[PDB]
Design a protein around this ligand. Sequence first.
Ligand code: MOV
Ligand code: GDP
Ligand code: MG
Length: 167
Amino acid sequence: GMTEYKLVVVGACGVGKSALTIQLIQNHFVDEYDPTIEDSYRKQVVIDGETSLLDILDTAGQEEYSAMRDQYMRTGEGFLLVFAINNTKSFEDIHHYREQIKRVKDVPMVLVGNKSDLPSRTVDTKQAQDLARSYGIPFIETSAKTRQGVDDAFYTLVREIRKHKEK
Ligand SMILES: *CCC(=O)N1CCN(c2nc(=O)n(-c3c(C)ccnc3C(C)C)c3nc(-c4c(O)cccc4F)c(F)cc23)[C@@H](C)C1
Ligand SMILES: Nc1nc2c(ncn2[C@@H]2O[C@H](COP(=O)(O)OP(=O)(O)O)[C@@H](O)[C@H]2O)c(=O)[nH]1
Ligand SMILES: [Mg+2]
């Protein structure tokens, strides 16, 4: 059989939410994707031998309340919290994104450090590890450019959802 998963990708503008999503959906790096496009995208994959259909909301709007988005997130099963390792402000926003999610919703999440290909690092892996530990969630390093960690990020989130469902 198969299992469907309703996922949401959040994080500051320009961290690579769309690039990550498109790597999952289409398996290549789309470097120019309209920063204002918010949509859900579906992709069939296989995770630990089970056919898995992922529906992924790639967030992009700036408003505090956006009806369709909020109804999606209210019923979202897991969230990727994405920052960029070269942008300290994106990492500082993570705890605010976590707060907003809890507000709309124990919720499966994965902390994602994207742009790991860039040498101009400003956020240390160890800081990201501290934060993920404080929430009791996984931390995964990614590059949407090279595709490093992309499956790890989404598949780890699915694995976190499986665990949550057992409870
Ligand atoms: C290039 C544009 C882009 O990618 N954006 C990403 C989404 N986005 C955004 N901005 C933002 O300030 N908030 C927000 C709001 C509206 C209120 C309080 N805090 C925040 C941030 C700092 C956490 C966004 N909030 C959400 C969000 C809401 O509103 C509710 C539940 C879960 C959420 F993640 C959101 F989806 C996007 C937010 C801007 C930067 C554009
Ligand atoms: N070098 C590098 N650039 C990236 C990566 N992910 C996204 N980008 C670039 O960062 C910018 C913002 O990406 P985008 O997916 O639009 O971010 P979003 O606003 O979170 O959707 C774009 O110019 C992308 O080409 C990455 O992993 N590495
Ligand atoms: Mg985008």
